[PDB]
Design a protein around this nucleic acid. Structure first.
Ligand SMILES: [Zn+2]
Ligand SMILES: [Zn+2]
Ligand SMILES: [Zn+2]
Ligand SMILES: [Zn+2]
Lengths: 200, 200, 200, 200
DNA sequence: GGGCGTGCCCGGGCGTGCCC
DNA sequence: GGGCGTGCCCGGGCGTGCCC
């Protein structure tokens, strides 16, 4: 009955977890991940590689959904949307609706969804197993507004929720991470990690 | 025959109690809870998360009702309503009647009720059990006037009464807490707790 | 073309000016006037005597209009109205519309007007010459909200504009004074006069 | 043939100049004017009083037009518009089109225009002579975006151009001033004046 | 990569109807 | 008449995209 999707980690019976590349903290690196904060820092529209790791092979027809929600209780019930400026920037790839924050690049089977009851946006691709000898699959996500965008996220932190779902709709696994989209991911990761150590 | 709902705690056979988040006492925090006073301090229209804890699973069709009453004997028999200024502010979410003080956000099955005999307002949502691994459910309430509003609460303290009711109308459990809606919940919580220690 | 009436003093060819009684500055005096501030301090709904002085007798059919405007440039274009709480208090004398801030008591020929283009309220009585041996006429005004009323004046200072008008509509004279309606006119007059001396 | 209106001062045969109120430089004053910079600093949507001074009375039917242009050569040819976020904020007064940056408040004869060839916006009111004894007329303007608004002014300075025009369209006079719309006009005026003194 | 923006967060303290 | 309320004003200082 809640209109807020759950963020609770559920690694589930398939041993589902996420992985992130090691990029560093150079000032304006395009994408970097803080394990201490479970938080991805990235630039607007840049590639954000997310690895999907499983211990057991999901069944055929499994899907991978990504959605954003506001992290703070005060904002959770508000749908995460692109700001009006970027919604009109005509920067679509021909498939993503202009209002969707999260896109997937490099996938011929991407689907963009708007929930008819909650109005929330999500992007789905088929789950594909790793190639022989590889331990994970990688999806390239893109975030199409800065966290600071006026009339959109407006400086509020978001979580991305990644769910592994079978074709019937059963939740097989769920993981999430915080996101800041910003001009200087390396600067901002280092600032937030230092504030955690000094004041957290 | 009384037109005043009971505030008596009834944890009942399901072991029903409330829980509140730890927010601190920063001057203008949006919502904070004092265990010593059993009192929530929050800002107008801001999210107030309330956790529902049970020891035994309620039956299907159970409902959660919230209602406000004035705390002091002198004012108990007066219906708690929004003040005339805020009633006309056209700030409805499309479901809550403009006169109702307490709203629920983020729930697709909210129902707003006016008692035909007492004229008192209440807001009801279905009870949903916690997700596996979680110990409680959380409802987001909003209070749509300040305690100080002239022509409404007019500086008088209120209690929020939360009842767990089966579909037939049986009371399964009841809990309550005092509320102050104010501009500076952290200041005011600290003032009230200090006055309790010094003069209570 | 402006929707804001002029406040410019125009003593005019009849030598029109206002006079006020000497009341003192006892804490909760019902009405008191500060010449230094050209400001009347009064309590809600209490009698405020205003004297009309002329050097030459106005023609028959002359009228006396009172209107309120906000003093600050930022608020001048907003119509001064009673707040929603007091508008519903059913405290009318049978003639004053419930939304009008300024009333006249003790006059059998009072007229309450709403301007069809600016929506502003005014109250009008016939001008009557002083009795033989007297130098002025007195009108008893009442202000039906406090300056602090939420959803009304909301702590903003107002001016009352008194105009002497002939029956044809010509402006014969205009005077104005600031008003604060408050619980403690004597306290507040003394505070404002001291602030003028110390910080003005 | 140019699509950029001229900003050249033309006090003209009527001796047309502008005047501004003395407000000070308190940090968040709603509006303040720097003579040294010929620059108004104001908050979003707040009243900005502008005085019109003439030496000779303009003919009947004279109009007062206000328009914004970007100050820097690099941006002059771009039409000044509200940003997409504020354009959708449904904050219209019922007359101003939602895309127009400059509004006039308190005038029953305001007209909002879009030039059919340059697409530029302007707002026009009738010229009214000062009341007897007064030396100027005052118009209340409002600026409906911050200078910093993303997708609108985007941190770029603008000029407001005020023209006095006869009913036939002849330019009788022209004046202009720079504008910054910001959260803290007093801070920002002081910063800009200090930078002028130290680095200009 | 260093450092300036600039809307907004933050705690100190003044209001002002009402309690005493 | 003395003095406590309590929403809001106020200046200090942190953001964060962008200039350099
Ligand atoms: Zn954006
Ligand atoms: Zn209220
Ligand atoms: Zn009132
Ligand atoms: Zn804008």
């Amino acid at each position: 009955s809640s209109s807020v999707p759950s963020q609770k980690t559920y690694q589930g019976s398939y041993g589902f977890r996420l992985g992130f590349l090691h990029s560093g903290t150079a000032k304006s690196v395009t994408c970097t991940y803080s394990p201490a904060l479970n938080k991805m820092f990235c630039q607007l529209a840049k590639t954000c590689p997310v690895q999907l790791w499983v211990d057991s092979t999901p069944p055929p027809g499994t899907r991978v959904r990504a959605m954003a929600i506001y992290k703070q209780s005060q904002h959770m019930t508000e749908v995460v949307r692109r700001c009006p400026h970027h919604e009109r920037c005509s920067d679509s790839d021909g498939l993503a609706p202009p209002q969707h924050l999260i896109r997937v690049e490099g996938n011929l089977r991407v689907e963009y969804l708007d929930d008819r009851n909650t109005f929330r946006h999500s992007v789905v691709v088929p789950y594909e197993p790793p190639e022989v000898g590889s331990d994970c699959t990688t999806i390239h996500y893109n975030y199409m507004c800065n966290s600071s965008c006026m009339g959109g996220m407006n400086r509020r932190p978001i979580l991305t929720i990644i769910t592994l779902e079978d074709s019937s709709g059963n939740l097989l696994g769920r993981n999430s991470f915080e996101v800041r989209v910003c001009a200087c991911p390396g600067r901002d990761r280092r600032t937030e990690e230092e504030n955690l150590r000094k004041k957290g």
